[PDB]
Amino acid sequence: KQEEYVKIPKDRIAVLIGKKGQTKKEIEKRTKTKITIDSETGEVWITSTKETEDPLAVWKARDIVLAIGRGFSPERAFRLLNEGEYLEIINLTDIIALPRVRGRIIGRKGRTRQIIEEMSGASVSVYGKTVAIIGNPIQIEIAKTAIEKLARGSPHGSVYRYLERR
C-alpha cells in the first residue's frame, strides 16, 4: 500500500484525463497504478495496486502527473518512465518581470528552448510561474544552468558557448 497526493492546475486536468479518460488510463497501464482525479480542485491521488512493481512506479506516475500539470504533453511526460530520468520543477521567481523571463528562456519562436533541449538532452516546459525539466541528473543540471543564465540576462552567445562546452 502507497499513496501520493498532488495538485495540478484546473487548466491541465482535461489533458491529464484526455479523450474519454484515454490518457489517465494510459498512465495507469504503463505504471500499474490507480490515478484518482478531482475535476473541481485539480487534486490527484496516485495509488499502488497489487500489480505495482515497486515504490518507484508510484513516484514515476506522480511525476508524470506533475509534468503534465506543469505544461508537458502526456507523450513528453512519459519520458519519465525511463530509468535514470527525473523531473525538476523550478519556480521562475527564484532564478531571477515574469513574461520577460519566459521570453528569455523560450526565445524568438521558441528557438532558444529548442537549443537548450538539443544541447542538454533534457526536455523543458515553460508554463506559468515555472520551468520544468525532464532528464537524467546531468542533463537536468546543464539545462537548469543555461536557463538560470538566460533568466539573469546572460547574452545568447555566452549561453550557447556554455552549452557547446557541456
PDB file of C-alpha atoms in Angstrom:
ATOM      1  CA  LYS A   1       0.000   0.000   0.000  1.00  0.00           C
ATOM      2  CA  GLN A   2       1.157   3.515  -1.080  1.00  0.00           C
ATOM      3  CA  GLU A   3      -0.447   6.855  -1.888  1.00  0.00           C
ATOM      4  CA  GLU A   4       0.974  10.022  -3.457  1.00  0.00           C
ATOM      5  CA  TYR A   5      -1.109  13.165  -3.424  1.00  0.00           C
ATOM      6  CA  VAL A   6      -0.607  16.140  -5.747  1.00  0.00           C
ATOM      7  CA  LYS A   7      -2.412  19.161  -7.161  1.00  0.00           C
ATOM      8  CA  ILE A   8      -2.250  20.305 -10.807  1.00  0.00           C
ATOM      9  CA  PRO A   9      -3.848  23.447 -12.362  1.00  0.00           C
ATOM     10  CA  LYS A  10      -7.517  23.227 -13.381  1.00  0.00           C
ATOM     11  CA  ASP A  11      -6.137  24.295 -16.763  1.00  0.00           C
ATOM     12  CA  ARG A  12      -4.401  20.896 -17.070  1.00  0.00           C
ATOM     13  CA  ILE A  13      -6.935  18.367 -15.769  1.00  0.00           C
ATOM     14  CA  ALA A  14      -8.581  17.879 -19.163  1.00  0.00           C
ATOM     15  CA  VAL A  15      -5.149  16.973 -20.664  1.00  0.00           C
ATOM     16  CA  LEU A  16      -4.355  14.560 -17.799  1.00  0.00           C
ATOM     17  CA  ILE A  17      -7.733  12.781 -18.383  1.00  0.00           C
ATOM     18  CA  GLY A  18      -7.720  13.093 -22.193  1.00  0.00           C
ATOM     19  CA  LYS A  19     -10.189  11.715 -24.788  1.00  0.00           C
ATOM     20  CA  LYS A  20     -12.696   9.666 -22.706  1.00  0.00           C
ATOM     21  CA  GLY A  21     -10.087   9.030 -19.993  1.00  0.00           C
ATOM     22  CA  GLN A  22      -7.645   7.621 -22.546  1.00  0.00           C
ATOM     23  CA  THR A  23      -4.559   9.458 -21.206  1.00  0.00           C
ATOM     24  CA  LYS A  24      -5.349   8.784 -17.500  1.00  0.00           C
ATOM     25  CA  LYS A  25      -5.764   5.098 -18.419  1.00  0.00           C
ATOM     26  CA  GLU A  26      -2.544   5.113 -20.414  1.00  0.00           C
ATOM     27  CA  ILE A  27      -0.683   6.311 -17.319  1.00  0.00           C
ATOM     28  CA  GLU A  28      -2.415   3.690 -15.153  1.00  0.00           C
ATOM     29  CA  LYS A  29      -1.492   0.911 -17.604  1.00  0.00           C
ATOM     30  CA  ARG A  30       2.192   1.905 -18.029  1.00  0.00           C
ATOM     31  CA  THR A  31       2.866   2.328 -14.278  1.00  0.00           C
ATOM     32  CA  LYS A  32       0.335  -0.180 -12.861  1.00  0.00           C
ATOM     33  CA  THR A  33      -1.147   2.411 -10.545  1.00  0.00           C
ATOM     34  CA  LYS A  34      -4.565   3.880  -9.968  1.00  0.00           C
ATOM     35  CA  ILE A  35      -4.928   7.603 -10.594  1.00  0.00           C
ATOM     36  CA  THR A  36      -7.872   9.347  -8.973  1.00  0.00           C
ATOM     37  CA  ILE A  37      -8.702  12.865 -10.138  1.00  0.00           C
ATOM     38  CA  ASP A  38     -10.848  15.561  -8.528  1.00  0.00           C
ATOM     39  CA  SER A  39     -12.020  17.603 -11.573  1.00  0.00           C
ATOM     40  CA  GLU A  40     -13.132  20.516  -9.386  1.00  0.00           C
ATOM     41  CA  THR A  41      -9.926  21.018  -7.405  1.00  0.00           C
ATOM     42  CA  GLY A  42      -7.144  19.612  -9.607  1.00  0.00           C
ATOM     43  CA  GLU A  43      -6.304  17.252  -6.749  1.00  0.00           C
ATOM     44  CA  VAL A  44      -4.746  13.930  -7.843  1.00  0.00           C
ATOM     45  CA  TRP A  45      -4.110  10.728  -5.896  1.00  0.00           C
ATOM     46  CA  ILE A  46      -1.649   8.147  -7.210  1.00  0.00           C
ATOM     47  CA  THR A  47      -2.185   4.811  -5.510  1.00  0.00           C
ATOM     48  CA  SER A  48      -0.465   1.465  -5.833  1.00  0.00           C
ATOM     49  CA  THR A  49      -2.364  -1.730  -6.763  1.00  0.00           C
ATOM     50  CA  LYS A  50      -1.451  -5.440  -6.498  1.00  0.00           C
ATOM     51  CA  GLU A  51       0.251  -5.041  -9.918  1.00  0.00           C
ATOM     52  CA  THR A  52       2.570  -2.172  -8.862  1.00  0.00           C
ATOM     53  CA  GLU A  53       6.210  -3.227  -9.384  1.00  0.00           C
ATOM     54  CA  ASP A  54       7.741  -1.223  -6.541  1.00  0.00           C
ATOM     55  CA  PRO A  55       7.599   2.206  -4.808  1.00  0.00           C
ATOM     56  CA  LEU A  56       9.252   3.923  -7.796  1.00  0.00           C
ATOM     57  CA  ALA A  57       6.321   3.028 -10.037  1.00  0.00           C
ATOM     58  CA  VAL A  58       4.094   5.290  -7.902  1.00  0.00           C
ATOM     59  CA  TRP A  59       6.684   8.156  -7.803  1.00  0.00           C
ATOM     60  CA  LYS A  60       7.002   7.929 -11.574  1.00  0.00           C
ATOM     61  CA  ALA A  61       3.258   8.078 -12.137  1.00  0.00           C
ATOM     62  CA  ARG A  62       3.126  11.022  -9.734  1.00  0.00           C
ATOM     63  CA  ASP A  63       5.935  12.798 -11.591  1.00  0.00           C
ATOM     64  CA  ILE A  64       4.190  12.209 -14.931  1.00  0.00           C
ATOM     65  CA  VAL A  65       1.039  13.795 -13.474  1.00  0.00           C
ATOM     66  CA  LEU A  66       3.153  16.717 -12.157  1.00  0.00           C
ATOM     67  CA  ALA A  67       4.962  17.038 -15.532  1.00  0.00           C
ATOM     68  CA  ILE A  68       1.594  17.215 -17.410  1.00  0.00           C
ATOM     69  CA  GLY A  69       0.376  19.716 -14.812  1.00  0.00           C
ATOM     70  CA  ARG A  70       3.444  21.880 -15.431  1.00  0.00           C
ATOM     71  CA  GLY A  71       2.803  22.049 -19.158  1.00  0.00           C
ATOM     72  CA  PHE A  72       4.382  18.907 -20.693  1.00  0.00           C
ATOM     73  CA  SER A  73       2.190  16.993 -23.158  1.00  0.00           C
ATOM     74  CA  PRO A  74       1.487  13.422 -21.991  1.00  0.00           C
ATOM     75  CA  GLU A  75       3.727  11.984 -24.772  1.00  0.00           C
ATOM     76  CA  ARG A  76       6.602  14.164 -23.459  1.00  0.00           C
ATOM     77  CA  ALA A  77       5.886  13.434 -19.726  1.00  0.00           C
ATOM     78  CA  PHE A  78       6.078   9.646 -20.491  1.00  0.00           C
ATOM     79  CA  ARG A  79       9.837  10.174 -20.892  1.00  0.00           C
ATOM     80  CA  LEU A  80       9.823   9.940 -17.074  1.00  0.00           C
ATOM     81  CA  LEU A  81       9.105   6.166 -17.359  1.00  0.00           C
ATOM     82  CA  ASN A  82      12.719   5.697 -18.497  1.00  0.00           C
ATOM     83  CA  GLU A  83      15.127   4.689 -15.737  1.00  0.00           C
ATOM     84  CA  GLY A  84      17.522   7.397 -14.522  1.00  0.00           C
ATOM     85  CA  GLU A  85      15.053  10.048 -15.708  1.00  0.00           C
ATOM     86  CA  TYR A  86      13.833  12.649 -13.199  1.00  0.00           C
ATOM     87  CA  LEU A  87      11.560  15.660 -13.082  1.00  0.00           C
ATOM     88  CA  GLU A  88      12.673  19.014 -11.723  1.00  0.00           C
ATOM     89  CA  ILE A  89      10.287  21.966 -11.280  1.00  0.00           C
ATOM     90  CA  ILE A  90      11.746  25.456 -10.894  1.00  0.00           C
ATOM     91  CA  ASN A  91       9.750  28.481  -9.733  1.00  0.00           C
ATOM     92  CA  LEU A  92      10.739  31.253 -12.149  1.00  0.00           C
ATOM     93  CA  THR A  93      10.580  33.595  -9.221  1.00  0.00           C
ATOM     94  CA  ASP A  94      13.730  32.295  -7.551  1.00  0.00           C
ATOM     95  CA  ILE A  95      16.050  32.219 -10.558  1.00  0.00           C
ATOM     96  CA  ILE A  96      15.787  35.992 -11.201  1.00  0.00           C
ATOM     97  CA  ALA A  97       9.175  40.714 -14.750  1.00  0.00           C
ATOM     98  CA  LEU A  98       7.756  37.188 -15.460  1.00  0.00           C
ATOM     99  CA  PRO A  99       6.609  37.282 -19.124  1.00  0.00           C
ATOM    100  CA  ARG A 100      10.100  38.712 -19.830  1.00  0.00           C
ATOM    101  CA  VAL A 101      11.846  35.803 -18.121  1.00  0.00           C
ATOM    102  CA  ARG A 102       9.684  33.321 -20.043  1.00  0.00           C
ATOM    103  CA  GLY A 103      10.617  35.050 -23.316  1.00  0.00           C
ATOM    104  CA  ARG A 104      14.298  34.944 -22.479  1.00  0.00           C
ATOM    105  CA  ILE A 105      14.103  31.167 -21.899  1.00  0.00           C
ATOM    106  CA  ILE A 106      11.800  30.418 -24.890  1.00  0.00           C
ATOM    107  CA  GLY A 107      13.412  32.789 -27.425  1.00  0.00           C
ATOM    108  CA  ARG A 108      12.063  34.024 -30.747  1.00  0.00           C
ATOM    109  CA  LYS A 109       9.569  31.381 -31.997  1.00  0.00           C
ATOM    110  CA  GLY A 110      10.748  29.018 -29.215  1.00  0.00           C
ATOM    111  CA  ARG A 111      14.237  28.596 -30.793  1.00  0.00           C
ATOM    112  CA  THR A 112      16.186  29.129 -27.576  1.00  0.00           C
ATOM    113  CA  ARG A 113      14.178  26.459 -25.764  1.00  0.00           C
ATOM    114  CA  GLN A 114      14.832  24.080 -28.688  1.00  0.00           C
ATOM    115  CA  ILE A 115      18.581  24.904 -28.486  1.00  0.00           C
ATOM    116  CA  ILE A 116      18.558  24.183 -24.676  1.00  0.00           C
ATOM    117  CA  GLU A 117      16.846  20.816 -25.202  1.00  0.00           C
ATOM    118  CA  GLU A 118      19.016  19.660 -28.147  1.00  0.00           C
ATOM    119  CA  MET A 119      22.288  20.565 -26.433  1.00  0.00           C
ATOM    120  CA  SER A 120      21.493  19.474 -22.872  1.00  0.00           C
ATOM    121  CA  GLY A 121      19.384  16.382 -23.835  1.00  0.00           C
ATOM    122  CA  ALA A 122      16.723  17.417 -21.275  1.00  0.00           C
ATOM    123  CA  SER A 123      13.050  18.138 -22.113  1.00  0.00           C
ATOM    124  CA  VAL A 124      11.921  21.625 -20.981  1.00  0.00           C
ATOM    125  CA  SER A 125       8.479  23.092 -20.296  1.00  0.00           C
ATOM    126  CA  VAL A 126       7.983  26.802 -19.561  1.00  0.00           C
ATOM    127  CA  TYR A 127       4.499  27.236 -18.158  1.00  0.00           C
ATOM    128  CA  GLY A 128       3.029  29.980 -15.959  1.00  0.00           C
ATOM    129  CA  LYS A 129       5.286  30.529 -12.971  1.00  0.00           C
ATOM    130  CA  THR A 130       7.574  27.508 -13.505  1.00  0.00           C
ATOM    131  CA  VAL A 131      10.066  25.892 -15.808  1.00  0.00           C
ATOM    132  CA  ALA A 132      10.050  22.080 -15.629  1.00  0.00           C
ATOM    133  CA  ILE A 133      12.869  19.778 -16.777  1.00  0.00           C
ATOM    134  CA  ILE A 134      12.985  16.039 -17.546  1.00  0.00           C
ATOM    135  CA  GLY A 135      16.347  14.408 -17.882  1.00  0.00           C
ATOM    136  CA  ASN A 136      18.962  12.321 -16.211  1.00  0.00           C
ATOM    137  CA  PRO A 137      20.523  14.366 -13.368  1.00  0.00           C
ATOM    138  CA  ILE A 138      23.364  15.591 -15.604  1.00  0.00           C
ATOM    139  CA  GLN A 139      21.112  16.695 -18.476  1.00  0.00           C
ATOM    140  CA  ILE A 140      18.839  18.498 -15.947  1.00  0.00           C
ATOM    141  CA  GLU A 141      21.843  20.245 -14.388  1.00  0.00           C
ATOM    142  CA  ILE A 142      23.011  21.504 -17.830  1.00  0.00           C
ATOM    143  CA  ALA A 143      19.503  22.783 -18.906  1.00  0.00           C
ATOM    144  CA  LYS A 144      18.950  24.225 -15.438  1.00  0.00           C
ATOM    145  CA  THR A 145      22.262  26.155 -15.615  1.00  0.00           C
ATOM    146  CA  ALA A 146      21.554  27.526 -19.161  1.00  0.00           C
ATOM    147  CA  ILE A 147      18.028  28.581 -18.078  1.00  0.00           C
ATOM    148  CA  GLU A 148      19.423  30.349 -14.963  1.00  0.00           C
ATOM    149  CA  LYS A 149      21.927  32.265 -17.163  1.00  0.00           C
ATOM    150  CA  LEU A 150      19.174  33.282 -19.614  1.00  0.00           C
ATOM    151  CA  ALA A 151      16.867  34.370 -16.724  1.00  0.00           C
ATOM    152  CA  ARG A 152      19.635  36.647 -15.336  1.00  0.00           C
ATOM    153  CA  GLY A 153      20.088  38.375 -18.736  1.00  0.00           C
ATOM    154  CA  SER A 154      23.179  36.493 -19.958  1.00  0.00           C
ATOM    155  CA  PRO A 155      23.748  37.111 -23.692  1.00  0.00           C
ATOM    156  CA  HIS A 156      22.801  34.229 -26.007  1.00  0.00           C
ATOM    157  CA  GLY A 157      26.389  33.763 -27.170  1.00  0.00           C
ATOM    158  CA  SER A 158      27.624  33.094 -23.662  1.00  0.00           C
ATOM    159  CA  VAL A 159      24.796  30.586 -23.020  1.00  0.00           C
ATOM    160  CA  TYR A 160      25.278  28.856 -26.370  1.00  0.00           C
ATOM    161  CA  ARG A 161      29.043  28.579 -25.800  1.00  0.00           C
ATOM    162  CA  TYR A 162      28.408  27.167 -22.282  1.00  0.00           C
ATOM    163  CA  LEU A 163      26.044  24.587 -23.826  1.00  0.00           C
ATOM    164  CA  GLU A 164      28.588  23.622 -26.518  1.00  0.00           C
ATOM    165  CA  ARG A 165      31.131  23.002 -23.769  1.00  0.00           C
ATOM    166  CA  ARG A 166      28.718  20.674 -21.971  1.00  0.00           C
TER     167      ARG A 166
END
